[PDB]
Design a protein around this ligand. Sequence first.
Ligand SMILES: [Mg+2]
Ligand SMILES: [Mg+2]
Ligand SMILES: [Mg+2]
Ligand SMILES: [Mg+2]
Ligand SMILES: [Mg+2]
Ligand SMILES: [Mg+2]
Ligand SMILES: [Mg+2]
Ligand SMILES: [Mg+2]
Ligand SMILES: [Mg+2]
Lengths: 139, 25, 81, 220, 183
Amino acid sequence: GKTRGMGAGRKLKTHRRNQRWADKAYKKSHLGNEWKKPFAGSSHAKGIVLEKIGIEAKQPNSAIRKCARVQLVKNGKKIAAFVPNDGCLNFIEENDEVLIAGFGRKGHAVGDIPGVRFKVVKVSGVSLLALFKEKKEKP
Amino acid sequence: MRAKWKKKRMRRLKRKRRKMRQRSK
Amino acid sequence: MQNEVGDMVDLYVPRKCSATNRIITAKDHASVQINIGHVDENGLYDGRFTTFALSGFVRAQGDADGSLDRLWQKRKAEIKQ
Amino acid sequence: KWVPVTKLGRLVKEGRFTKMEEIYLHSLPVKEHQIVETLCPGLKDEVMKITPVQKQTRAGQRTRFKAFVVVGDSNGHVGLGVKCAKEVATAIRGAIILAKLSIVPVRRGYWGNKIGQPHTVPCKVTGKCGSVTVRMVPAPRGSGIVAARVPKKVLQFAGIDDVFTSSRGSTKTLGNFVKATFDCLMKTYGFLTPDFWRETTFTKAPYQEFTDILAKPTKA
Amino acid sequence: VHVNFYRNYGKTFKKPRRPYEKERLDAELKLVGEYGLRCKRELWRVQYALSRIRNAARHLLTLDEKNPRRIFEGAALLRRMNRYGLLAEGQDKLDYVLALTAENFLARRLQTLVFKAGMAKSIHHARVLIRQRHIRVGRQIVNVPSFMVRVESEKHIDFSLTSPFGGGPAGRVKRKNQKKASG
RNA sequence: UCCGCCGGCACCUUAUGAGAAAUCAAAGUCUUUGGGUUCCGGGGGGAGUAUGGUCGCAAGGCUGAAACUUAAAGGAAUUGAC
RNA sequence: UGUCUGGUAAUUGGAAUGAGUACAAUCUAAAUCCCUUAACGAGGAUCCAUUGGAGGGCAAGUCUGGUGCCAGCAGCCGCGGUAAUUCCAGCUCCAAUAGCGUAUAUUUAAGUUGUUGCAGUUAAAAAGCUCGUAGUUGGACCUUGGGCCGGCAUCGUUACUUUGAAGAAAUUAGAGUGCUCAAAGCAAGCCAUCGCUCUGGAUACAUUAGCAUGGGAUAACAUCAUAGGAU
Ligand SMILES: [Mg+2]
Ligand SMILES: [Mg+2]
Ligand SMILES: [Mg+2]
Ligand SMILES: [Mg+2]
Ligand SMILES: [Mg+2]
Ligand SMILES: [Mg+2]
Ligand SMILES: [Mg+2]
Ligand SMILES: [Mg+2]
Ligand SMILES: [Mg+2]
């Protein structure tokens, strides 16, 4: 089984160093690929609303999720961001200024929405929550 | 699908890829 | 077991097997207890007896008979027979 | 109301006992649930879970509710009952009966000092039920119970005040979790400490020293 | 460099691991109710302080008796407890301090002592009176209900000289009423 | 033919053992965790695939990813249905 | 039946007070904040508490109205197809409370990185098999009876263990100290002084490596019969 010699510290250390790589989280963090994602290791990002789209919810659900195809200004990547809080697709217009955030599962699709990992947090410098509750008006 | 025949399909794909790569070097 | 005053603190003191010394649990239903009566020089039962307890483990082993026989041979020496 | 059907109950009913530690002392097979009613003064009962299990028949699925009950005053006595019945009421009642029938004594020791009212298990004790292994380790006077909800309830009913617990295996399985906890609570009285190994003296069993009233005074 | 950066600073409460438990919620609400607190933080900080003290005592009890790094701080801890009215004169051992509990601490608060000294109609009236600058410990005005009193100062709590309840001029309400009745 | 010893391939009964169980006299002596040592696994796919290195006449062998996708895949046993 | 206890009312009363305002003094290099304080200052005491939720995990509704696999909610399981405990709202209730929600990173949870402490017949995982250097690991044997209780050499080497020294402060642990409490600070305290307590401003830990003292049990090296040995 294990090497229990008192003189075998190097063997145990090297074996653990080799075997840490099978870990999903450790390999995710120490491979450096997290910098090639659209956010490039950032909590939020900013973007321009390229277009407004809808995606059919995955089975067995049946609905149309009002997403938005936007383009990040920091690297130019094009991503789809969810728009929650029904009626909040109306606030978003064309080529508009939005603040995007992750969806919650750390680079994983959330819910029945196929392949969406971002949600719109702000539009034109105003939070979607304030507009939804009529606390603020779009400028 | 039987994994034996999947392995055979993979081998055919590998040899075809090798031929295609040898075509253009 | 013993408090700083010097009194009992556990509910009871268990029995331990007279062959393997392992204690007898309150839910050990294979553990038994035998009283072997003693006789007089004529061969009359005098009303006193020697008590042995065997745990379920030693019984289920099958060494209960040998252990009890050895215990009786050893014990009868002090109290004659 | 109650007509004893076994020697132990017939012995108890008139009042030839005070506590139930002498029954434990001879490891007698308690089989009537009124014995623990009469002997143990305080009993508290909380049901732990009501799990519906199913058996698929040709017509449909026959469902039966299995109930878990924990019994015992918080002064060293605890028991566990499991009963599966057609509907929840009889399941709960039968599980209460079984739990009262399965009361065992627990040993409470000290952590490092013998200031009165012992509050902890005496040793490191473990219990395995299928896959769920539970371990309790002695804790100082002010620690409290460090455990999940199920072992916490079992230990509170057992009378333990402070302990350090661990767990391994699928503890989501309530039956195995609680059975392992209760089983190792039984083991708490099983370790041979250096104080216990004073030579034992023997006492007549209740079946043997009450022979006078057990030959043929059937029920009078 | 900014010298003000060198001032140490810390936190005093911890918050519980499991937020939604019925028995714990009822226990905490029970304690808050008759100890006249404001939120679960006023009790969580008491739990935090008690946990620190208990951890220190448990660490001390793990050492050998003849260890000076046991004797010195054992004496110090027992001195502090006997000074704050927590441990009785019959509990002079390191084992008794492990048995301390939160209500022992909450019994020594200034609001609790004011209520139990008969000066307040209820433990909420005590807190209201404390926060309104009506209570002085020794000679010093105190308006902090969490003020933990010591045994030597337990015999000096009294309404302040400036207080109308301790021999002061009438408050603005009574003076306004006298002004109204003057004409 | 009978008895005994050492070595080997197995077999039968039984746990007081272990195990998720089937079962195992070793797959036991494990939360009461430590005899020595080698190799090797980290949810299911992508995939033993891409590429580099290297051995081979070739077929191929050894070493061997990533993006992306997914909430199950799987083991043992149970009751029905077929 | 009785009296007391306890709880609710945009009911009735009185008292209390600081948020605010402001003479004034104090603070300050000068101002300002704080502390102190004239005068004013609360009844729906409008001097109006918020953030998230109410199927499970997880504390709190199978209330009412709207929608009808649509709009949407939903971290996961899932909800909505004319009776929605899950969506849109009202009422009510729950948790925290001057704080709460959301996203990333990572600590715990994770005994799912396992030295402590995981696994490998069937769940993923023993190399087809053997040999083999480095590495790791290696049987037993050699002081016990013995009681008592300034010199002066020249020497097997280490690991281990004890004791000591040197060891930056800050941070951490920790003694004292009533900043009104606390987080803090290293201050202060007292007869009621032409002052005193020499006032205090402790103490630990700080891997490994290095220096020195004692111990020789357990371990590693070569030393072991051409006497080229000791005296
Ligand atoms: Mg995998
Ligand atoms: Mg609602
Ligand atoms: Mg609930
Ligand atoms: Mg409805
Ligand atoms: Mg594992
Ligand atoms: Mg398979
Ligand atoms: Mg396999
Ligand atoms: Mg093999
Ligand atoms: Mg050796």
